[PDB]
Amino acid sequence: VLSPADKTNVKAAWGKVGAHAGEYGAEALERMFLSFPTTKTYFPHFDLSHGSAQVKGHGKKVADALTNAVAHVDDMPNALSALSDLHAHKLRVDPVNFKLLSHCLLVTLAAHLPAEFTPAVHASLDKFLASVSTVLTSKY
């Protein structure tokens, strides 16, 4: 699915993102909620205002899931099984929303990593997120 170069590229971007991972995940969430308001109905009990502690806390969770995915990139189905169960079965998250958040995660990296977000790395990150999304919708 992912090439060795992809895996290399994704690892590199992760590395540069560093300890901002949580903050960037929260920003991606905000971007999604603002750009694609239909997504907000999955978070009725969240306060989704700017600077929300709940969005921040959640952004960190996302980021950590994604980090666990790159850390186990050759076995994402296994690594992400509980999250796949959660999203498809329990939350019944519409598969289209994964492309929306993936896009906002790309936008968020782009706006923060001038040097790292090259065309090649862009392509690798997109494939990485599509693979994560496939796993998280795989209980469909």
Partner: protein, 143 residues
Amino acid sequence: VHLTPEEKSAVTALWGKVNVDEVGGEALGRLLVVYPWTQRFFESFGDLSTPDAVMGNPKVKAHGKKVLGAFSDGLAHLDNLKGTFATLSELHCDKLHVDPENFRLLGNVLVCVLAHHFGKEFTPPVQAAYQKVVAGVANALAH
């Protein structure tokens, strides 16, 4: 599609700062790299065998300008995107047979390029406004 005054303000201010000689080419180029099936529509453009090849390709850059030209025209006519893109629609749909989903992808790539170029300035509100715009263009093209 209708942007609020603040939405219109967010789009307009940023678009003034766009290098119209380059951003188009970066967006088309990235599309061809990120979604490589789109390369099928540009076999006449020469070397597309590497990312560097695509990005440096003079024809990609040249053609990107026209795209961005159309996008700029789109921003100028938000209330009549249908009529504005009428001819481009016939071209892509009836002559080129490009699937409309690819318009959405190019729009989203453009947004990634704007984010890359403007960093922090490409705020979540600014992004939300641009997504409205690229959605409008895509749907206009798809009519």
